Amino acid sequence: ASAAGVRSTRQRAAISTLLETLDDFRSAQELHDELRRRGENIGLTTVYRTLQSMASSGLVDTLHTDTGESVYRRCSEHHHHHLVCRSCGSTIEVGDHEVEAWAAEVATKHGFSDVSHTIEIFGTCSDCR
Amino acid sequence: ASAAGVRSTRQRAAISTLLETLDDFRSAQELHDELRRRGENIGLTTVYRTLQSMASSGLVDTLHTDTGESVYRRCSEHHHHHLVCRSCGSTIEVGDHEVEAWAAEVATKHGFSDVSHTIEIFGTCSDCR
Ligand SMILES: [Zn+2]
Ligand SMILES: [Zn+2]
Ligand SMILES: [Zn+2]
Ligand SMILES: [Zn+2]
Ligand SMILES: [Zn+2]
Ligand SMILES: [Zn+2]
């Protein structure tokens, strides 16, 4: 409620804030540890759960490292597109020099000004089977 | 009205029907001529106007040949994507072997089943400036 529900949203805001400052993918462990170093007192279970909400509402992007651990980043600022899981919303960052190249030339081919494009991929994720 | 508005929709239906049977891009002239050969009595102005409505509501796709003439086809049945004019809705067919290739591998890369994708391009057309 007021001791709990206001302290809850205050935790999330602290997680959100740490992300805005990080430029690279980080595990939930690494993110918990840096919050701790920064004076926060936020349990690892709460961190993992928050990053999951973020990773499936499209605020953070995710990857699975050769370990098995999920890593996270606030959406990347440099132009890219996303792969998304239909079932849980898990968002993965995707791109390509030579796809983005195709999309540009084909517009100026037919003589179009003010070009823009949307590329989206979807599927049922590994976890979701 | 009943002599006019019912005969009007009857004309469009005859144009729509000819398209369902043609597999290749054809000018408004060529399409008028074949309607005529098929027993219809539909003026060239009405044909040109119908194909324009179709070309910008997304029923036919369009191209501009080295002459300057617009050519038209009912949407192609083989998998492709579209370029579209923001201003008039002019729909042009676009595709690529090596774009479609990228989209598939990147999904089965991260271990996704039941893959699908949407690619859309947009811009202000040559006619529209
Ligand atoms: Zn992203
Ligand atoms: Zn792009
Ligand atoms: Zn999933
Ligand atoms: Zn088409
Ligand atoms: Zn495709
Ligand atoms: Zn236009």
UniProtKB/Swiss-Prot annotation, chains A, B:
Signal peptide: none annotated. Keywords: Cytoplasm, DNA-binding, Metal-binding, Repressor, Transcription, Transcription regulation, Zinc. GO terms for biological process: negative regulation of DNA-templated transcription; regulation of secondary metabolite biosynthetic process. Zn(2+) 3 binds at H79, H81, E100, H117. Belongs to the Fur family. GO terms for cellular component: cytosol. It is found in: Cytoplasm. The N-terminal domain binds DNA and the C-terminal domain is involved in metal-binding and dimerization. Global transcriptional regulator involved in zinc homeostasis. The keyword Transcription regulation applies. Its main location: cytoplasm. Homodimer. The gene is zur. InterPro entries: FUR, Fur_C, WH-like_DNA-bd_sf, WH_DNA-bd_sf. It comes from Mycobacterium tuberculosis (strain CDC 1551 / Oshkosh). GO terms for molecular function: DNA-binding transcription factor activity; transcription cis-regulatory region binding; zinc ion binding. This is Zinc uptake regulation protein.
